[PDB]
Amino acid sequence: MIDIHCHILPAMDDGAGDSADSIEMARAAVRQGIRTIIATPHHNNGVYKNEPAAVREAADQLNKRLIKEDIPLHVLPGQEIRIYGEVEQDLAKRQLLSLNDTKYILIEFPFDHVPRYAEQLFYDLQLKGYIPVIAHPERNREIRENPSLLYHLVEKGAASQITSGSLAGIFGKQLKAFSLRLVEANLIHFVASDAHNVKTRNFHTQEALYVLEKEFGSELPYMLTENAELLLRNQTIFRQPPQPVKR
Ligand SMILES: [Fe+3]
Ligand SMILES: [Fe+3]
Ligand SMILES: [Mg+2]
Numbered sequence: 018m019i020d021i022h023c024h025i026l027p028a029m030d031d032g033a034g035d036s037a038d039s040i041e042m043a044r045a046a047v048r049q050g051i052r053t054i055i056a057t058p059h060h061n062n063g064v065y066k067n068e069p070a071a072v073r074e075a076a077d078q079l080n081k082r083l084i085k086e087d088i089p090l091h092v093l094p095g096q097e098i099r100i101y102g103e104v105e106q107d108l109a110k111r112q113l114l115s116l117n118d119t120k121y122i123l124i125e126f127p128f129d130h131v132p133r134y135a136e137q138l139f140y141d142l143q144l145k146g147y148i149p150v151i152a153h154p155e156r157n158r159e160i161r162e163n164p165s166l167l168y169h170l171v172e173k174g175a176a177s178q179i180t181s182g183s184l185a186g187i188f189g190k191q192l193k194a195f196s197l198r199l200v201e202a203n204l205i206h207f208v209a210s211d212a213h214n215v216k217t218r219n220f221h222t223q224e225a226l227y228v229l230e231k232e233f234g235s236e237l238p239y240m241l242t243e244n245a246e247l248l249l250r251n252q253t254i255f256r257q258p259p260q261p262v263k264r
Pocket of ligand 2: 022023032
C-alpha cells in the first residue's frame with residue numbers, strides 16, 4: 018500500500034521529532050501493510066517552511082537508515098502545501114513539491130475556512146495538467162458547516178484525501194460520522210494516515226479500511242487504495258460522480 022500524506026520526516030514539522038521517531042513510524046506503517054510513504058511535511062509562508070531540497074534530502078537520508086535497519090518501507094518526496102495565491106507560479110519555479118514529482122499536488126486549507134480563490138487556483142492548476150488533492154477536508158471547519166463547498170470543488174476537478182484516523186474514530190465519533198457522509202457522497206478519492214507519531218496521531222490504516230468495507234462494501238476501499246497506486250506512478254485515478262452531502 019501507498020500512503021500519500023504523512024509526517025514521517027524528522028525535525029521538520031509537528032511530525033517525527035528525530036530519526037528514532039521516524040523509524041518507529043516506519044515500523045508502524047509496515048505493520049499496517051504500508052510499503053511506500055510519500056512524505057508530505059507542512060510547508061507554509063511563516064511557521065513551517067520546508068523547502069523542496071530539504072525534503073528530498075531528509076527523505077533520502079531516512080531511506081538510507083531504513084535500508085540499514087532492514088525495514089521494508091520506501092519514502093518519497095512531497096509537501097503538504099498550505100494554500101496560497103501563488104501556488105501555480107512557485108510550482109513552475111520548482112519552489113514547491115508535488116506528490117512524488119507527479120501531477121498530483123497536496124493542498125491544505127487553513128483549519129477554519131476555505132479561501133474564495135481556491136476554485137480559481139484549482140482551475141488554473143488543472144490547465145497546467147496538475148490535479149489538486151485537498152488535504153483532510155473533514156477537518157476543515159467551513160467544509161463541516163457547509164459541505165457543499167467540497168462537492169463543487171470536486172465536481173470542477175479537485176480530488177480529496179480523507180484521514181484514516183478520522184474514519185477509525187480516533188478524533189471523536191462526530192468526526193467519524195462526518196467523514197462517512199463525505200465518502201458516501203463520492204467526494205473522497207484517497208485514504209491516507211496523516212500520521213504524526215505512534216502515540217496520538219498514528220496510522221489506523223487497517224481500521225479505516227475495515228470501517229469502509231463494512232459501511233460500503235469491499236470494492237470502495239479497494240478503489241481508494243488503488244487510487245494511491247495510480248497516483249504514485251503518475252496515472253489517472255478512478256472517480257465516481259460526486260453528489261450533495263446528507264445531514
Ligand atoms: Fe494538515
Ligand atoms: Fe498533514
Ligand atoms: Mg501537522
